[PDB]
Amino acid sequence: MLQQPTGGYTTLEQFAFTIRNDGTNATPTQFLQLLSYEATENELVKKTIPTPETHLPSARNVPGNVYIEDAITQALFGISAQNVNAHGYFSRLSALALPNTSARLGLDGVIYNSETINIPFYDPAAVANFAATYAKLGNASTPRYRADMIDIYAHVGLELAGTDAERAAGVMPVKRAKFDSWEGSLISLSRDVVNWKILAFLIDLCSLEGEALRAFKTRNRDVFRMMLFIMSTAVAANVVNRKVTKRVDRVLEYIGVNSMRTAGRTATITYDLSRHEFAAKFLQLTFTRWNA
């Protein structure tokens, strides 16, 4: 068992989140610094996010050790994932929800049915707090429990593009992101992000409380913003490049507006409808924890 520090698991160097950039392992914050936003005439106002459902989907009798982190990260940032709600192994997180369950969530991002040797795993209390919320990804497809997949993106914009005044206001102009760019920059970004061990982030996010939580929320704001960025590019209506005197600025229109697009494109990862419903759910839960 991995001990959880007074800070999160994210304080451990083992769980550093870092996109590749200019040939180096850049922190998400030093990528987001490259970003710049042109305003447009449209306005985003953030509606209250509906409380996530009480229901925890059944962890069906599964003999296998589900690879959950891979399923989640590929469902959110995966270049090729589709029909993510067909298998429905996300429900498996609710095996971890129970008090004194035999099941362990390994650092590998796998949900072992029982504790097993030479596989380090997160502290079960932490995982229980984490599962009590994120098992609800397992009902992202069921019609009764689906998240709104349009309004939620406003929050995304505010949490990404939004200046501190726009965030305090709860309302920002719809923006148009841009940054100096290398070829395939968003594909490479998203793949650097799929490799992130985000269960560390989500687990500290659900387990930590008090100042120790708030100290986490500032420290990892940029990380959450990078995840939000990859999703944003996934749902952006269009993603052009601009020549700018022997330099190129990648430009996505628009931050905070889900275009509901599903036809694939070379520039960025694409959501099938299932990935849209899933991502909407994920945002519902995660933003719910993020604002409390």
Partner: protein, 49 residues
């Protein structure tokens, strides 16, 4: 101190693989963790229980 003498210790995987299930079926509390702030009397209580 002689080679048999000293402070005995073992890896957790050895613990899990062998002694732990025997602790389970013998109906005893799971032996206490030692924070290092722990009293020797507490260790005595655990070895007792």
């Amino acid at each position: 101190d002689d080679l048999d003498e000293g402070i005995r210790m073992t890896t957790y995987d050895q613990y899990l693989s062998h002694i732990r299930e025997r602790l389970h079926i013998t109906n005893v509390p799971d032996p206490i963790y030692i924070t290092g702030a722990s009293t020797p009397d507490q260790i005595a209580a655990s070895v007792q229980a």
